[PDB]
Design a protein around this ligand. Structure first.
Ligand code: ANP
Ligand code: ANP
Ligand code: MG
Ligand code: MG
Lengths: 331, 343
DNA sequence: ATGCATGCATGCATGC
DNA sequence: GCATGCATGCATGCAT
C-alpha cells in the first residue's frame, strides 16, 4: 500500500520521523520473534535464552518488539496485581577497568526495575537504598556487593518479571584473565537460579566463545541464531529484494527510486543485514529531505555508505562467527 | 579582496590580530565541514564520527566552527528549550599513567556541562557531585568511577546535546595491554549507546588503531578523512596556489610580497596542511611587524620555518596514515567476490 | 543519655 | 617505596 500520500505535504521532519517509526516484518525476523516469544511462554527448565546475531540483523529491535508485546499481554493481568512487573531489560555496561563490574550492574538492575508504586517493597534490606528526595533510586555507595545482590534478589522475587533482558551481553566477556572468565556467566546463572527469573542474553558473535565454555551451558540454555540474509541462497536474495521493494514503496519521496535493481550494491555494504540497510536508507532520505530532492540516485547511496574497509572487517567478523556456528556432534 | 587598508594606521597588535582572526575557506575544509554537518544532523544510530588528519590541518578549527554554527542554529529554539545544551566539547587528557584515566575524563565531562543558572539542572548525581555554592560543579574525590559515570549519563540524557566532541582523541590509545584497546573504546561505545548521544572523535593518525577494533564498532562508526593537499595531483596544487594567493592578499603590510612564486618551498615545509602554512605565515608576519618592514622576504620565511627533520617525521607519519587510509576498486571487487558474484 | 546515622581519617591489599 | 581505591575504624553529631 506504501506510505500515506499526504505526508508529501508535511515538513521534512515529519516524513523523516515516519520512516524511522515504520517497521518491516521480514520473514527471518518473524521466525526469530515467534521462537523467542514461544520460549518465553515456557522456560522448559532452561535458565537462559541466548540470541546472537550479526550486527545490524535486528537484535535490539526484536528485543523492543518483545517488551511491547509482553506489556500488551500483561496489562490485563497487571490490572489485578499492580505490584507484578512484566519485563525488565537493560544494556550491559562495558567496563572501563580490566574486568566487568558486577556491582554497578546490580545497581543498574535495581534502577531498571524501579516501580512508581515503591510502597509495595520499599524495604529490600536497604541501607538507605530506597529513593528519597527524588524519583530515582539512590543506592548507597558503601553498601557491599553481597548486600546489594541480596537486595536485587529480593526485588526480583517480589516483582517477579516474566523475563530479564541483557542488551549487548558481549560486555560480560571482558575480564582481566583467560581463566577468570569461567566465573562470570556461572555467577549470573546462580543469580538466575535463585531468583527463578528467566534471563535472556542478546549480543553479537563475540559471546559465542563465551557461550560454550562447557556442554552444561548448552544443556541449560536455548540458542536463537538471528541469521542474516545470505546471498548464497536465492531465497534470501529474493527476501532482500522484497525488503528493498517495501522500503522503496514506503520512503516518503515524490518519486519512488528504483532501489531493487541495485540490490548487489546494497548487499555489498549491508551484508544481508536489515538494520544496517534501514540506517543507510534513513541517512539517504535525510540527505534528500535536507536537499528537498525528488528522487534518489546512486550517488546518494554512495555518499552515506559505509567505507569498503568497514565492510571488509564486518564481513570477516560475521563469516568467522558463522563458521564458529558449526560445532559438530559428539557422535 | 585583501585586508581593510585602514589597518595600516593601527598598531602592530591590531594588524596581527586581524590576520589571526582571518579564515580561509579552502575547498577540502568546506567538503569535510559539510559532511560533518550532515552526519551530525542525522546520527542514524551511528555511535562514532572519526575525523582524523595530520597535525596542522584544520581539525580543531573545524571543531570550533561546528560548535559555533550549531549554537547559532539552536539559539532560536534555545529561547524555548531552556534545559538543552546544544553542543558540549572536551579535550581528551593525555595521562601520566601508562593507561588513560577515565575518572578525570568523567569529572571534566561534568565540568563541561556547566550552567551558572542551577535551575536548568538542579540535581546531577547521588552525592558529592553538587556545586559548592558556585558555578563550578566540583566533584568530591571519594566519589567512585561507576557512580560518576552514572551521574554523567543522567546529566547527558537530560541536557540531550546534539553531539559530544572529544578533541585530540588519540590519547584513548594509552593502555597497558594490546587487546585491552578494544575495551578502551568499548567503554565509550557503551556510553554512547546508553545515552543516545553521538560522539565525534578528532585526532591525528595515531588513532587509526581504533579504525577496525571490532565489526560492531566498525558498523557504529563513520569515517571522515580530513584530506591534506597532495602535490601529486595538479588539482590540489591549484587549490594550494589559491590559498597562498589569498594569504598574500590578506596579510596586513605596506606591500604584498609574492608568496605564490615560492609555492614549492611552502609545500616542502608544510606538507600541504593549510593550518601549518597559516601558522608559519603568522610567525613571519609577526617578525616583520616587529621589524616594521615593508615587505616579507624569503629570508624571513627561512628564519622561522620548520626544520627538515620535523618535516620528514611528519611526512613519514602521514604516508603511513594515507597508506592505511587508501582504497581501490580492486578491494571492492575482492570483497564482492567473497560475497558472491562480483561486478 | 544512649544508641544510632554519617563523615572523615587511617589502613591495607593491590599494583608496580 | 609510592601510588591507588575500597573498606572500615574511630569519632562526632543527632535526636528522640
Ligand atoms: N526489521 C526492522 N524494521 C524496522 N526498523 C528496523 C528493523 N531492523 C532494524 N530497524 C531499525 O534499526 C534500529 C535498530 O537496529 P538494531 O537491530 O539495534 O541493529 P543492531 O545491530 O542490533 N544495534 P547494534 O547490534 O548494537 O549495533 C532502529 O532504529 C530500528 O528502527
Ligand atoms: N581552514 C583554516 N582556515 C583558517 N585558519 C586555519 C584553518 N585550518 C587551520 N588554521 C589555522 O591553524 C591553527 C589551528 O590549526 P588546527 O586545526 O588546530 O591544527 P591541529 O592539528 O588541529 N592542532 P593539533 O591537532 O593539536 O596539532 C590556527 O592558527 C588556525 O588559524
Ligand atoms: Mg543492536
Ligand atoms: Mg589540533
Amino acid at each position: 500500500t506504501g506510505f500515506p500520500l499526504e505526508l508529501l505535504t508535511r515538513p521534512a521532519t515529519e516524513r523523516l520521523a515516519y520512516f524511522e517509526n515504520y517497521t518491516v516484518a521480514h520473514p527471518r525476523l518473524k521466525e526469530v520473534y515467534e521462537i523467542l516469544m514461544r520460549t518465553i511462554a515456557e522456560p522448559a527448565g532452561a535458565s537462559f535464552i541466548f540470541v546472537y546475531g550479526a550486527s545490524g540483523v535486528g537484535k535490539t529491535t526484536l528485543r523492543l518488539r518483545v517488551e511491547q508485546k509482553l506489556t500488551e499481554l500483561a496489562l490485563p493481568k497487571l490490572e489485578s496485581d499492580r505490584a507484578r512487573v512484566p519485563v525488565v531489560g537493560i544494556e550491559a555496561i562495558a567496563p572501563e577497568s580490566r574486568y566487568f563490574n558486577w556491582k554497578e550492574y546490580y545497581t543498574r538492575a535495581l534502577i531498571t526495575l524501579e516501580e512508581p508504586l515503591i510502597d509495595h517493597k520499599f524495604d529490600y534490606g536497604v541501607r538507605g537504598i530506597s529513593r528519597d528526595n527524588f524519583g530515582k533510586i539512590n543506592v548507597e555507595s558503601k553498601v557491599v556487593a553481597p548486600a546489594l545482590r541480596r537486595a536485587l534478589e529480593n526485588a526480583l522475587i517480589h516483582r517477579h518479571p516474566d523475563v530479564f533482558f541483557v542488551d549487548e551481553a558481549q560486555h560480560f566477556g571482558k575480564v582481566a584473565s583467560g581463566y577468570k572468565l569461567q566465573d562470570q556467566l556461572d555467577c549470573l546463572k546462580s543469580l538466575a537460579n535463585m531468583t527463578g527469573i528467566l534471563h535472556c542474553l542478546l549480543g553479537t558473535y563475540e559471546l559465542l566463545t563465551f557461550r560454550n565454555l562447557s556442554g552444561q551451558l548448552s544443556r541449560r540454555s536455548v540458542d536463537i541464531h538471528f541469521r542474516r540474509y545470505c546471498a548464497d541462497s536465492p531465497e534470501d536474495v529474493q527476501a532482500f529484494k522484497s525488503v528493498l521493494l517495501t522500503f522503496q514503496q514506503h520512503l516518503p519521496l515524490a518519486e519512488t527510486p528504483n532501489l531493487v535493481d541495485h540490490w548487489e550494491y546494497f548487499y555489498e555494504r549491508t551484508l544481508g543485514c536489515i538494520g544496517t540497510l534501514k540506517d543507510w536508507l534513513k541517512r539517504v532520505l535525510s540527505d534528500a529531505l535536507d536537499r528537498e530532492a525528488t528522487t534518489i540516485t546512486l550517488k546518494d547511496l554512495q555518499k552515506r555508505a559505509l567505507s569498503v574497509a568497514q565492510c571488509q572487517k564486518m564481513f570477516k567478523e560475521i563469516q568467522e562467527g558463522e563458521r564458529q556456528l558449526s560445532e559438530t556432534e559428539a557422535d
